[PDB]
Design an enzyme around this catalytic site. Sequence first.
Site, PDB file in Angstrom:
ATOM      1  N   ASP A  21      41.805  68.686  45.121  1.00 37.03           N
ATOM      2  CA  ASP A  21      43.139  68.114  45.201  1.00 37.03           C
ATOM      3  C   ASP A  21      43.078  66.598  45.214  1.00 37.03           C
ATOM      4  O   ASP A  21      42.803  65.982  46.258  1.00 37.03           O
ATOM      5  CB  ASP A  21      43.800  68.665  46.468  1.00 37.03           C
ATOM      6  CG  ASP A  21      45.255  68.207  46.654  1.00 37.03           C
ATOM      7  OD1 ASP A  21      45.785  67.316  45.938  1.00 37.03           O
ATOM      8  OD2 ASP A  21      45.975  68.765  47.501  1.00 37.03           O
ATOM      9  N   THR A  22      43.379  65.993  44.053  1.00 35.64           N
ATOM     10  CA  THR A  22      43.348  64.533  43.904  1.00 35.64           C
ATOM     11  C   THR A  22      44.480  63.852  44.699  1.00 35.64           C
ATOM     12  O   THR A  22      44.386  62.649  44.977  1.00 35.64           O
ATOM     13  CB  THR A  22      43.498  64.132  42.461  1.00 35.64           C
ATOM     14  OG1 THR A  22      44.670  64.794  41.952  1.00 35.64           O
ATOM     15  CG2 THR A  22      42.327  64.704  41.594  1.00 35.64           C
ATOM     16  N   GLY A  23      45.514  64.616  45.056  1.00 34.92           N
ATOM     17  CA  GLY A  23      46.594  64.133  45.939  1.00 34.92           C
ATOM     18  C   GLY A  23      46.327  64.072  47.446  1.00 34.92           C
ATOM     19  O   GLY A  23      47.059  63.375  48.182  1.00 34.92           O
TER      20      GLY A  23
END
Lengths: 99, 99
Positions: free
Chosen positions: B25-27
């Site tokens: 999850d890059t967020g």
Amino acid sequence: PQITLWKRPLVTIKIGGQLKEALLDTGADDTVLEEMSLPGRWKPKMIGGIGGFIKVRQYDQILIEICGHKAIGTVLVGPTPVNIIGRNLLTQIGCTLNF
Amino acid sequence: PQITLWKRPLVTIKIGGQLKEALLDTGADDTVLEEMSLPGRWKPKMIGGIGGFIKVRQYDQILIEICGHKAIGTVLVGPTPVNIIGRNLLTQIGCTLNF
Ligand SMILES: CCC[C@@]1(CCc2ccccc2)CC(O)=C([C@H](CC)c2cccc(NS(=O)(=O)c3ccc(C(F)(F)F)cn3)c2)C(=O)O1
């Protein structure tokens, strides 16, 4: 572009002729934007995040430009900490994860 | 590995001798895992996401293997609905977003 992850992956988007900042989020199925007006009708959707479920308004076939790249698809509007670009639009602009 | 975003970017990780499935999850600023025991000291932390905030336990200097790649960093443990690998560890394995 190639975006490293030392900082939040925040880009400029454009929606309804308005510039906004949004988080590129590969852990999100959907794209979720803070409260704003969009054209057309909406339908109800419930989505889940780390803190629980939220009720959002679903708008289909919305034009949105993401870091210079055109996309047209579903945008959900509701209580979110930040504008989130999820996989439904990340796929449209050709985004992959690489390591 | 180049991962397309047609589906949820789920990978196998190894932590505390356990093989687990986790979401890249890059967020997420932080890595947060469903309830498990980990060694050493921990402190309480509150983290926000979609749906609001959850209370987690913070463990520093934890070693994790992510698709064969070793990474050390802070691992949070709490009532997340899915195991999440966040930016603090994605950077260590040289993970980037490309489009
Ligand atoms: C639109 C749903 C988004 C998501 C879905 C998780 C999921 C997946 C499959 C099934 C069920 C649920 C993924 C996600 O990145 C977050 C948030 C960031 C938007 C998230 C994830 C991990 C940790 C945090 N907290 S934090 O302190 O590390 C943090 C706080 C704030 C931000 C900010 F950039 F969004 F502001 C990023 N990270 C938040 C979340 O809450 O749920």
